[PDB]
Write a protein that binds this ligand. Structure first.
Ligand SMILES: O=S(=O)(c1ccc(NC(=S)NCc2cccnc2)cc1)N1CCCCC1
Ligand SMILES: O=S(=O)(c1ccc(NC(=S)NCc2cccnc2)cc1)N1CCCCC1
Lengths: 471, 470
């Protein structure tokens, strides 16, 4: 069973001996720190953490003893605030005396702004604010996945609109392939849910249950998939029978969209000779609602996509849309799902546009790039103490390392506001109390063991929309 | 509760309809596919997956019903193999009819060798082998953390040996700071455990319970930490009282080692004037078993470490060890825990060596670099079907994409062997049966719902030792 007393960085066990004596309040904040691009971030994921790990009775006698036992061996020493944890158990029935205020989930906020704050609500528990830094900071992951996914949606939107004149089906243009490529089952669920803030297409099934349990949607599920082959289901037919494999699969899935990986042996032969000739008659007969999607999966992503389109364009009746771009017949599409990340995505759609191919023809799948190839320093997600009360006097605190101004932290009690021009500003040093900048956008989401404000996944999606969708 | 029917890539739900008719056997293997860095990998982590996710009754009526209902909406259609999963429920009390063979955990194996194989043990369950691909492939993560961690140990061993003449304390030279910097609590435990294959220092507490539950050690815990400050415990004192914080902290932890982050405002002032002058009397009085560890945390990692050492070297009595390298007194050490990954680790120790500073003086902490900044394509960890039986005939299968020879997969039934020169070789096409290369080195680790072979964490550590250690 999960034990919050064992869910922190080891050294934090020792911090109650280190703060100034007579400290009654430790107040800390989280930001995606600005760096001398990712200029705005999607705030998403805290609600999962609050419900799964922080709310309710999270301290018991048994958990205190278990922690005591582990730390004794781990430190080879008795450092451990047993009295501190006992207090929480006795006074608050094991509920955390903490208040957390946060910007609404889905909000899109420029770098360098307060996203949430944390403070103890009982003077005895000054040490608890930063005990839970470690667990709260892990919100960097769904923030970064949601943000990186949204940035890719921006690229797709721009090129889809330019080459086709609209944004139809944009929400299905980037599919989550990342399940096998992440570091754990829990990560899979979290990462997949964050991608679903921006898109509807996913094969990472774990995301669905997480959304259902922690956020909720009006619709039965937040994400969808389609039948698709893998190399095993083609190669199992044997090298000489790729055509048989292709024919069997498209016939089994005759009335729904189906994707077929076509690069097992020779992607170009597959497109030109197998799909383009031998099996052409099984393709041109398909419904617009059930296209064949040809999937290359190797080689230079841009070069391969262009060559595949060139091949298909000569075997199938291509049209020219109102924007002047080439368009495959509606029963035929392509998906590139190898080596796609935000950089290569950009390179492919720009390459397609140069060669006069509509973005309508293509979709993208991304695995490692979408859910795993990300770190906390991408957006500099960071949690820092900015205000303490010692001997009844509040003081504004911060770090400001001499060799790295990028690492300076904010001072005092913080609040987030709309500017007169409608942008965002974070007020420091309790200046939000002057009430010159309207209402604080941070809301109490957690207080004394209770989740006090929640958002549906539908609300979050609304908050995270692109401007171009809004227009 | 975990549901194995909902723990695969969506498209695999539809694969039982795509294999050739009358397929009775699907046989697949995992390798860290070949194609000068990372020439060998540490096999670690499969045992966790087998025990947590795959063994025992993993199928129930409720789980089948749940999966059916989810996939109906997810595909907007009925494609779920309800009958297949019901078969496993009724016939095997929900135990998976699968056999898995693997190299022992902790083994160090060159790239491009079979590490484990999976095949169905019931003809009705041909589809099951690749259903579980997604969960098994996640073994890439502990494999990769363990391997990258071990490669860093190799660098540290080399330079520690060169600058000091021995390897004393090597297993504490790279400390895991990665807890806040990974993607989840589960990943924290897995990754931290993987680092502990090679080292004993960690602040990622989640790794301890994982090892205790899934692997086991003779010792009470597999990993250790020491008291240390963070920025909040220094800055809380106010900008004008940095000295007061340092004094309080080292006095609270007077007889155990203690690290104190010293760069809140000015690392060089902290080292030269606060530690080096004002509080010097509290440092030189400390025990060899309870040093102060000064911790810079910003700026260019190599430049900062060198300047910190030069500062301390002028304020404290430095000696010269038998190898001719400079050594701080035993009550004083440094730890660099910012921007450390395998590349910068190399740069720092090399730079220290060039300036005649012993590696004894320094330790490293690594967070994101150790546990998060890693992907499945670093070692090309990959799972592929190599052998099927259809209509009672065995067929050797593989992929071989024309534009990428690096993606070619192995053919047929696989086995792992020792060569005459004592190396590893992977035999394909059932050739291990020819018995020209002795016994298959893979062991059956899972069969029909049961874990059939397992390793303690102590054995894994032994298997993963460096040559120089041996
Ligand atoms: O976007 S689409 O072209 C589209 C087509 C096919 C797939 N699925 C694929 S390629 N799965 C293969 C796979 C799965 C997991 C991991 N690695 C590979 C997704 C999306 N599409 C959506 C809406 C209806 C029309 C067509
Ligand atoms: O290797 S050591 O120098 C050494 C010193 C200090 C720490 N801990 C530190 S700096 N924690 C700070 C921190 C924790 C978590 C995340 N981010 C930062 C580890 C190791 N060491 C070991 C053996 C006995 C003597 C001394």
């Amino acid at each position: 069973e999960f034990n919050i007393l064992l869910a922190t960085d080891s050294y934090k066990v020792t911090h109650y001996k280190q703060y100034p004596p007579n400290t009654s309040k430790v107040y800390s904040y989280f930001e995606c720190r600005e760096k001398k691009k990712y200029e705005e971030t999607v705030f998403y994921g805290l609600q999962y953490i609050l419900n799964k790990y922080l709310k309710g009775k999270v301290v018991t006698k048994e958990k205190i003893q278990e922690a005591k036992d582990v730390y004794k061996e781990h430190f080879q020493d008795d450092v451990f605030n047993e009295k501190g944890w006992n207090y929480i158990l006795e006074k608050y029935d094991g509920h955390l005396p903490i208040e957390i205020k946060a910007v609404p989930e889905g909000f899109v906020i420029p770098r360098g702004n307060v996203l949430f704050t944390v403070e103890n609500t009982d003077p005895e528990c000054y040490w608890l604010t930063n005990w839970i830094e470690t667990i709260l900071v892990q919100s960097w992951y769904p923030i970064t996945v949601a943000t990186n996914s949204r940035e890719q949606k921006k690229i797709l939107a721009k090129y889809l609109l330019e080459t086709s004149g609209n944004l139809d089906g944009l929400e299905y243009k980037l599919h989550d392939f990342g399940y096998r490529g992440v570091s754990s089952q829990e990560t899979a669920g979290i990462g997949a849910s964050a991608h679903l803030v921006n898109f509807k297409g996913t094969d990472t099934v774990a995301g669905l249950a997480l959304i259902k349990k922690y956020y909720g949607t009006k619709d039965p599920v937040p994400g969808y998939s389609v039948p698709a082959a893998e190399h095993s289901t083609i190669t199992a037919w044997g090298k000489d029978h790729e055509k048989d494999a292709f024919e069997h699969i498209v016939t089994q899935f005759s009335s729904v969209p189906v994707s077929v990986v076509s690069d097992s042996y020779d992607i170009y032969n597959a497109c030109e000779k197998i799909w383009g000739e031998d099996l052409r008659h099984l393709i041109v007969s398909r419904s617009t609602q059930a296209p064949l999607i040809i999937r290359p999966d190797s080689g230079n992503p841009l070069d391969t996509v262009l060559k595949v389109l060139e091949i298909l364009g000569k075997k199938f009746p291509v049209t020219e849309n109102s924007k002047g771009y080439k368009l495959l017949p509606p029963y035929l599409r392509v998906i590139q799902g190898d080596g796609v990340d935000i950089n290569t995505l950009q390179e492919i759609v720009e390459g397609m546009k140069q060669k006069m191919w509509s973005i309508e023809n293509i979709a993208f799948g991304s695995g490692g790039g979408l859910l795993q190839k990300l770190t906390r320093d991408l957006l500099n997600c960071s949690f820092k103490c900015s205000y303490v009360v010692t001997n009844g006097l509040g003081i504004n605190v911060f770090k400001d390392p001499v060799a790295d101004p990028n690492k300076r932290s904010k001072k005092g009690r913080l609040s987030l506001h709309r500017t007169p021009a409608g942008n965002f500003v974070t007020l420091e040093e309790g200046k939000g109390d002057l009430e010159e900048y309207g209402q604080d956008l941070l809301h109490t989401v957690f207080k004394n063991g209770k989740v006090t404000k929640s958002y549906s996944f539908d609300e979050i999606r609304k908050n995270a929309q692109l401007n171009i969708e809004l227009e």
